[PDB]
C-alpha cells in the first residue's frame, strides 16, 4: 500500500505516545473538526505564523481520534501524514510519481475508515506553477472525498494558493491564533512532564512561568509557543549537560541565564556577583571622562534600570547629550560601550549628520521591495537585528533632517523601528545616545563649570527651537555637559597621557615622561580653553610632544623609556644619540 | 485595528490609499488583488493642533482652539480625506486633576509590568508623594509623558541601585525626604 | 552509501589531525552543544560576521 511507504500514521503515533499532548486551542480543534465533518469540500487548512502550534493542532486531531472526542461522523477514522516523497521520491518516467499520488488517493477513499490525509508544508502542492501540479487533490476536493487537512504559513499562503486560485476554492482556511502568555504558560505546564523525562530534571513551576514571559520580552522574532519552549528545553538541556559535565532542576534563574546566552541580553544573566562593577559604573566611567558627572550618572542610571529589569520593556534608553565640542559627549558614549561590552567597537555608530531628507531613511531602514538594493536594513536593521543589547550613537543629531528624526520617534518609543520590507526590529533592549552642539551659544556664556541655571535653560530653549516637541518628549533625559574647568583639564591630562601609552604598540614608544607636575601644568594651562573643550590637549600633546618624538625616533635618539624636558615649550631627552 | 502613528507625514499616494481605506476599503495590493478591509478599525494620529493647544487656555479643548486646530488639519490633508473619517477628536490636555489620577495608575502599571514581583511596590506614596509626582511632574505642555520621566528619575533609579546593593530583599519602602525633596525612597534591609 | 558519498566525516578528519585545533570559544561551544543536547529542535545555527570562526566552532565540536 502506498500509504505504508509514503505516509505516517499520526493516529498510530498518538496511540504510541509519540506526539505531545495538546494544550488548549479548543476552538481551533473544534473548527478543524467541524470542517472535516462537512459533506462537501471538507478540507481545512491551518494558517498562521510559523511557531504558532498549528502542527500541534494536527497532533490534536490524532489525539481526539484516539480517544474518540471526535464526533460520530469522524470517529471511525485514521490520520496519516503524507510525505512529499509520494511525489518527491523521483519523477523519473514522467507521470509515475503522479500515479503514486493517485494511488494514495485510491487507498484513502476505498472503504477502510475515514482516512484523512494530512498535508504538511502544503505549499508543495503548487507543483511547477500549475502545469506539473496536475490534479493534486483535484477530484478529491471537488467531491468532499479523500478529505485532507493541511497546514502552512501566511507568508507561504500569500503566494502558493493565492497564485493557484483553485486551491483556494478547494481548501477552507482556518487561522490558528498565537497564544497569550497565560496560554503559553499553560502549554509549558502541559508539556512539563515530557521535558522532565526528556532530560531527567524537575522543572520549577516558576521557571515555566518565567520562560513564557521572558520569551515574550526577549525573543520577538519567534512566536510564543516556540520561544517559550526553546527557553524551557534549552534550560533543561543545560541542566542535563551540567549533569554529564560533572542539581537536577530548572529554576527561573536557569532560564534567565540561558536566555541571555541565546539572546545576548546581559540583563538576564542575573550576575549578582558583578553588581559591584555595575554599582561603581559611575566610578569606572569617570576614569575616562572627567567631570561631566551628571551625564555619567544619567547613563549609569539607565544601565542600572535595565540590569535590574525595572527599565520599561518598551522604552529604549534615550539621551540627548548637549555641549561644546570637546566636552566628551561622543567619548562618554564610546566609553559606555567600552564598559558594557569591554569593547568600544560593539557600538553601532550612525553618522547621523549624513542624513539629508531624501536618503536618510533608506540608510537606516533600507528601501522597500522593488527599488535597487534589497540588503534592506542599511545600518539599523542590519545591526539591531543581531545586537539588541547594543548602543546606538547618532553623532550630531541636530543635523539630521527632521524627517529622519521623525523615524527615530518610533525607535525612541516602543522600539518599533521597522525595516523597509515591513519587518519589525524590536530594539527596546538598546541604549540610544544622540549628540548635538545646539547649546553652544549658551555654553559659551561661560556661566560656570557646572553649567549654571539660565544657561541651561537657554540651551533647553535652543533645543526646543530646533527639534519638534514630539521628538523631545521621547527623550529619557536631556543632558547638558559641563564646561571643562582647569581642574578638569588637569585630570584630563593625566588620562590623555595614559592613552598615549596605551597606543604604544611597541616598547620603543614609551614614556617615563617626567615633568609630572611641570608638563602637567604646562599642558593644563595651554589646553584650558573653553572654545575647544578638552580637544586642544590632543593638539598640545601632538605638537609639543609627539611630533618631536617622531623625529627623535627617525634620528635614533631614542630606544625606549622617553623623557620630556621643559623649554622656556617642551622638548625631548636624547637618550642614545644617532645609534 | 490599525494605527497610523503620524498619518500626517504621509505623502498623497498613501493618503490616497487611506481614502480608499476609509470609504470602500477594497484596497488594491501591489500584487493586483484587493483586500476589502471595511471591517477593520482605522486610527490615525497627527500633531497639527500643537500650535493652538499649547496656549494652555483651558484643558478641555475650547471652541477657538478647536477651529484653529481643524484649520491646520484642513490645510494639511485634503478635505476629501477628512470627510471620510468617522470622527476627528482633539484630545484634552491633562489637567492637574487628571494627573493625580494618572499618577496612581502609572504606579500600578509599574507594578503590573514588574515581571516576577519579589520586589514589589508598596507604593507608600501617601498624599505627599502623590502630590510630589503629580505636582512636579505636571509639565502641562508635554501631557502626561513627563510623569514617567519623573518616576524613572526619582524612584526607579534609586530602587534599582538599592536592588543592586541588595539593600532590599522584597517589597519597597516609599516616603518623602525634606521639588528639592526629590521624594527619595527609604532603605529596606 | 548516501552520507558516505555526499559528506565529509568531520569527526574522522579531526581524529586524523587534519583540522585546526580550536582555541577557546568555550561559551559558544557550550551553547552549541547545549542546543544539540535538546530533545526537540536540537538544531543550532551559528550566525555572525563573514569570517569569525564558525567553521572553527564546528571543528571544535568534532574535537
Ligand atoms: N498548544 C500546544 N499544545 C501542545 N504542544 C504545543 C502547543 N504549541 C506548541 N507546542 C509544541 O511546540 C511545537 C509547536 O510548533 P509546531 O506547530 O510544530 O510548528 P509550526 O507551528 O508548524 O510551525 P511550522 O510551520 O511547522 S515551523 C510543537 O511541535 C509542540 O511540540
Ligand atoms: N571630559 C573629558 N574627559 C576626558 N577626555 C575628554 C573629555 N571630554 C573630551 N575628551 C576628549 O575629547 C576627544 C573626543 O572628542 P569629544 O569631546 O567627544 O568631541 P564631542 O563633542 O564629544 O564629539 P563631537 O560633538 O563631534 S566634538 C577625546 O580625545 C577625549 O579624550
Ligand atoms: N578559536 C579558533 N581556534 C582556531 N582557529 C580559529 C579560531 N577562530 C578562527 N579560527 C580560524 O578561522 C579559520 C577558518 O575560518 P572560518 O570559521 O571558516 O571562517 P568562517 O567563520 O567560516 O567564515 P566563513 O563563513 O567560512 S567566510 C581557520 O583557519 C581557523 O584557524
Curated annotation (Swiss-Prot), chain B:
Record note on what altering residue 138 to W does: Site-specific fluorescent probe in an otherwise Trp-less HSP104. Fluorescence of this Trp changes in response to ATP and ADP binding at NBD2. Has no effect on ATP hydrolysis or protein stability
GO molecular function, one term: ADP binding
GO cellular component terms, A-Z: cytoplasm; cytosol; nuclear periphery; nucleus; TRC complex
Compartments, record wording: Cytoplasm; Nucleus
Function field: Required, in concert with Hsp40 (YDJ1) and Hsp70 (SSA1) and small Hsps (HSP26), for the dissociation, resolubilization and refolding of aggregates of damaged proteins after heat or other environmental stresses. Extracts proteins from aggregates by unfolding and threading them in an ATP-dependent process through the axial channel of the protein hexamer, after which they can be refolded by components of the Hsp70/Hsp40 chaperone system. Substrate binding is ATP-dependent, and release of bound polypeptide is triggered by ATP hydrolysis.
Further comment found in the protein's record: Present with 32800 molecules/cell in log phase SD medium.
Official protein name in the record: Heat shock protein 104
Gene: HSP104
Residues shown, of full length: 682 to 884 of 908
Amino acid at each position: 500500500e502506498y500509504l505504508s511507504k509514503y505516509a505516517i500514521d499520526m493516529t498510530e503515533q498518538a496511540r504510541q505516545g509519540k506526539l505531545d499532548p495538546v494544550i488548549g486551542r479548543e476552538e481551533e480543534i473544534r473548527s478543524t473538526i467541524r470542517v472535516l465533518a462537512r459533506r462537501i469540500k471538507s478540507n481545512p487548512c491551518l494558517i498562521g505564523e510559523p511557531g504558532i502550534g498549528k502542527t500541534a493542532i494536527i497532533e490534536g486531531v490524532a489525539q481526539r481520534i484516539i480517544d474518540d472526542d471526535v464526533p460520530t461522523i469522524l470517529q471511525g477514522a485514521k490520520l496519516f501524514s503524507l510525505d512529499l516523497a509520494a511525489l518527491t521520491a523521483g519523477a523519473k518516467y514522467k507521470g509515475d510519481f503522479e500515479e503514486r499520488f493517485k494511488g494514495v488517493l485510491k487507498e484513502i477513499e476505498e472503504s477502510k475508515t475515514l482516512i484523512v490525509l494530512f498535508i504538511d508544508e502544503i505549499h508543495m502542492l503548487m507543483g511547477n506553477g500549475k502545469d506539473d501540479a496536475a490534479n493534486i487533490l483535484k477530484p478529491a476536493l471537488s467531491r468532499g472525498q479523500l478529505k485532507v487537512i493541511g497546514a502552512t504559513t501566511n507568508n507561504e499562503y500569500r503566494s502558493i494558493v493565492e497564485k493557484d486560485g483553485a486551491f483556494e476554492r478547494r481548501f477552507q482556511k482556518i487561522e490558528v491564533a498565537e497564544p497569550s502568555v497565560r496560554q503559553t504558560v499553560a502549554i509549558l505546564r502541559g508539556l512539563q512532564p515530557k521535558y522532565e523525562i526528556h532530560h531527567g530534571v524537575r522543572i520549577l513551576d516558576s521557571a515555566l512561568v518565567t520562560a513564557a514571559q521572558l520569551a515574550k520580552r526577549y525573543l520577538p522574532y519567534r512566536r510564543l509557543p516556540d520561544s517559550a519552549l526553546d527557553l524551557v528545553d534549552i534550560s533543561c538541556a543545560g541542566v542535563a549537560v551540567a549533569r554529564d559535565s560533572k542539581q537536577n532542576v530548572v529554576d527561573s534563574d536557569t532560564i534567565s541565564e540561558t536566555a541571555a546566552r541565546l539572546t545576548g541580553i546581559p540583563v538576564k544573566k542575573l550576575s549578582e556577583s558583578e553588581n559591584e562593577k555595575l554599582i561603581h559604573m559611575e566610578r569606572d566611567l569617570s576614569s575616562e571622562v572627567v567631570g561631566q558627572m551628571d551625564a555619567i550618572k544619567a547613563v549609569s542610571n539607565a544601565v542600572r534600570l535595565s540590569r535590574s529589569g525595572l527599565a520599561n520593556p518598551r522604552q529604549p534608553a534615550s539621551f540627548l547629550f548637549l555641549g561644546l565640542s570637546g566636552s566628551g559627549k561622543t567619548e562618554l558614549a564610546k566609553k559606555v560601550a567600552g564598559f558594557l561590552f569591554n569593547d568600544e567597537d560593539m557600538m553601532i555608530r550612525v553618522d547621523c549628520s549624513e542624513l539629508s531628507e531624501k536618503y536618510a531613511v533608506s540608510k537606516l531602514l533600507g528601501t522597500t521591495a522593488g527599488y535597487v538594493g534589497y540588503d534592506e536594513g542599511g545600518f539599523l536593521t542590519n545591526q539591531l537585528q543581531y545586537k539588541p543589547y547594543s548602543v546606538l550613537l547618532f553623532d550630531e543629531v541636530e543635523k539630521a533632517h527632521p524627517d529622519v528624526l521623525t523615524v527615530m520617534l518610533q525607535m525612541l518609543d516602543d522600539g518599533r523601528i521597522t525595516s523597509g520590507q515591513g519587518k519589525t526590529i524590536d530594539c527596546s533592549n538598546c541604549i540610544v545616545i544622540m549628540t548635538s552642539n545646539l547649546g553652544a551659544e549658551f555654553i559659551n556664556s561661560q556661566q560656570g563649570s557646572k553649567i549654571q541655571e539660565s544657561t541651561k535653560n537657554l540651551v533647553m530653549g535652543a533645543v526646543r527651537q530646533h527639534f519638534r516637541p514630539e521628538f523631545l518628549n521621547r527623550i529619557s533625559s536631556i543632558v547638558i555637559f559641563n564646561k571643562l574647568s582647569r581642574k578638569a583639564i588637569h585630570k584630563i591630562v593625566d588620562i590623555r597621557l595614559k592613552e598615549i601609552e596605551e597606543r604604544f604598540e611597541q616598547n620603543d614608544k614609551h614614556y617615563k615622561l617626567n615633568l609630572t607636575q611641570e608638563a602637567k601644568d604646562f599642558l593644563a594651562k595651554y589646553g584650558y580653553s573653553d572654545d575647544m573643550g578638552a580637544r586642544p590637549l590632543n593638539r598640545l600633546i601632538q605638537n609639543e610632544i609627539l611630533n618631536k618624538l617622531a623625529l627623535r625616533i627617525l634620528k635614533n635618539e631614542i630606544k625606549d623609556k622617553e623623557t620630556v624636558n621643559v623649554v622656556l615649550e617642551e622638548c625631548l631627552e636624547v637618550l642614545p644619540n644617532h645609534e
